[PDB]
Design an enzyme around this catalytic site. Structure first.
Site, PDB file in Angstrom:
ATOM      1  N   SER A  45       0.812  -1.224   0.000  1.00 13.82           N
ATOM      2  CA  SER A  45       0.000   0.000   0.000  1.00 13.82           C
ATOM      3  C   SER A  45       0.842   1.269   0.000  1.00 13.82           C
ATOM      4  CB  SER A  45      -0.965   0.041   1.204  1.00 13.82           C
ATOM      5  OG  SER A  45      -1.967  -0.974   1.119  1.00 13.82           O
ATOM      6  N   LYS A  51       0.259   3.410  -2.922  1.00 12.89           N
ATOM      7  CA  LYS A  51      -0.875   4.335  -3.090  1.00 12.89           C
ATOM      8  C   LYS A  51      -0.369   5.786  -3.230  1.00 12.89           C
ATOM      9  CE  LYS A  51      -4.486   1.492  -0.998  1.00 12.89           C
ATOM     10  NZ  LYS A  51      -3.657   0.286  -0.776  1.00 12.89           N
ATOM     11  N   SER A 100      -6.267   2.616   3.621  1.00 15.98           N
ATOM     12  CA  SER A 100      -5.567   1.730   2.687  1.00 15.98           C
ATOM     13  C   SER A 100      -6.546   0.908   1.855  1.00 15.98           C
ATOM     14  CB  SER A 100      -4.585   0.813   3.430  1.00 15.98           C
ATOM     15  OG  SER A 100      -3.442   1.520   3.830  1.00 15.98           O
TER      16      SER A 100
END
Ligand SMILES: [Cl-]
Length: 242
Positions: free
Chosen positions: A47, A50, A95
């Protein structure tokens, strides 16, 4: 330029853990880590991806702004906070993988690859499925490579618009008080061994910025809180935060 301080290994060993913390003093242009080798070992970003994914989605207009609502698709997932509508801010905070999977699909392989090269991001390899390569595909990034990328973002030097970078840095806001601001992103990689946790970002002070990137072995989800806890113990030890 890079100094190894093995005294920090105590913050990992004390938790029966192993990992690396990398710190970068922006004013002094000096780096510190407990483990030079692991600082340069490349892992799935999970994550933490991201951060670039948000930047690319914003710059291409896939995401119009941080208020745009990405409605839950109605499919019940095991993480409760995922089963609701999100905008960029809350999708970062929780997330929310499925939201970012749709971003990736709309970005598409060709543009994703081109932008990760422009960012000099990790090994720049998106091999795998366009909607999951950061979780189980070919992309890899080291702690020191996370620092390099984050520094460009902090200075608005990535090859996307200033606006896109300001929005993502807003979305990265994690903690703020009268003493410091932390902009950061967690990660949790479980699909390929070794399972690891990430925390990457920076600490803003009145007169300096300290970038950090840490990863640690994460054999179970029970240890996820150690990503922030260990980093903060290092930051406290170095008198960066009270
Ligand atoms: Cl902000």
């Amino acid at each position: 330029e890079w100094q190894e301080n093995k005294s920090w290994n105590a913050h990992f060993t004390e938790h029966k853990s192993q990992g690396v913390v990398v710190l970068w003093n922006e004013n002094k242009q000096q780096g510190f880590t407990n483990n030079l080798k692991r600082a340069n070992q490349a892992f799935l970003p999970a994550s933490t991806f991201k951060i670039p994914n948000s930047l690319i989605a914003l710059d291409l207009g896939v995401v119009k702004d941080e208020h745009q609502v990405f409605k839950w698709d109605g499919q019940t997932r095991d993480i409760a906070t995922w089963n609701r509508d999100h905008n960029l801010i809350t999708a970062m905070k929780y997330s929310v993988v499925p939201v970012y999977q749709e971003f990736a699909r709309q970005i598409g392989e060709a543009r994703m690859s081109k932008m990760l090269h422009a960012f000099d991001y990790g090994n720049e390899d998106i091999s795998g499925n366009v909607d999951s390569f950061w979780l189980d595909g070919g992309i890899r990034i080291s702690a020191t490579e996370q620092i390099s990328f984050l520094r460009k973002l902090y200075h608005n030097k990535l090859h996307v618009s200033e606006r896109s970078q300001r929005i993502v840095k807003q979305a990265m806001l994690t903690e703020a008080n009268g003493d410091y601001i932390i902009r950061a992103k967690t990660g949790y990689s479980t699909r390929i061994e070794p399972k690891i946790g990430w925390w990457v970002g920076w600490v803003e002070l009145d007169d300096n910025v300290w970038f950090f990137a840490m990863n640690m072995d994460m054999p179970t989800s029970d240890g996820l809180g150690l990503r922030q806890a260990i980093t903060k113990e290092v930051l406290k030890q170095e008198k960066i935060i009270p």
